């Protein structure tokens, strides 16, 4: 999972979000986007993941916000089975402020999986003065 897209129409008619992790940083863009039908950065070979198709948007017209900061924890290579990482976020916009709360936990040894039990609290991460409307979101497999 690379990031998320937030919006209401996603057809260059209304402004929209784009959050995605790359390189050793993060990029968050608020802009009018002409999003393609299928949103991915997967495809260039058979199996070794490639960051191909960097511009999932056909074009980028007048934007409003730009932001680059310290990225999140990264998992190298592709491993199947015994998934030791859990990452949980909450996303909410109120009063024109976008709040993202993030939490990371290691050493998940639950083979059956199905969203783990117990208890954990989430810390504030960042607040963005975006000031737009938001109705629907997706996830950016890439």
Partner 1 sequence: KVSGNYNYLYRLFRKSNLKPFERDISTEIYQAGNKPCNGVAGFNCYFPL
Q: Which residues bind ligand NAG (CB under 6 A)?
A: 8, 22-23, 27, 44-48, 50-51, 54, 133, 135
- In terms of CB distance, is 25 or 105 closer to ligand NAG? 25
Give the span between the Cα atoms of 55 and 76, in whole angstroms: 23
Binding site for partner 1 (CB under 8 A): 13-15, 95-97, 129, 131-133
- In terms of CB distance, is 25 or 133 closer to partner 1? 133
**Residue corresponding to tokens 């997967």:** 42
Q: Which does 129 bind (CB under 5 to 8 A by kind): partner 1, ligand NAG, none?
A: partner 1
Angle at 139 between CA 74 and CA 46, to 5 degrees: 70
3-state secondary structure of 25: strand
Smallest gap, in angstroms, from Cβ of residue 130 to partner 1?
Answer: 9
- In terms of CB distance, is 92 or 104 closer to partner 1? 92
- DSSP 8-state secondary structure symbol assigned to residue 96: T
Query: In Å, how far from its chain's centre is CA 83?
Result: 20
CB 19 within 8 A of CB 142: no
Smallest gap, in angstroms, from Cβ of residue 100 to ligand NAG?
Answer: 18
């Amino acid at each position: 999972i690379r990031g998320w897209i937030f919006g209401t129409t996603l057809d260059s008619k209304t402004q929209s979000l784009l959050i995605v992790n790359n390189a050793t940083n993060v990029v968050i863009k608020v802009c009018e986007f002409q999003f393609c039908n299928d949103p991915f950065l997967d495809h260039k070979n058979n199996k070794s993941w490639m960051e191909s198709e960097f511009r999932v948007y056909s074009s980028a017209n007048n934007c409003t916000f730009e932001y680059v900061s310290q990225p999140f924890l990264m998992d190298l290579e592709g491993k199947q089975g015994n998934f030791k990482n859990l990452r949980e976020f909450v996303f909410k916009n109120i009063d024109g402020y976008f709040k993202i709360y993030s939490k990371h936990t290691p050493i998940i040894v639950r083979e059956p999986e199905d969203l783990p039990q117990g208890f954990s609290a989430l810390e504030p991460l960042v607040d963005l003065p975006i000031g737009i409307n938001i109705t629907r979101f997706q996830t950016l497999l890439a």
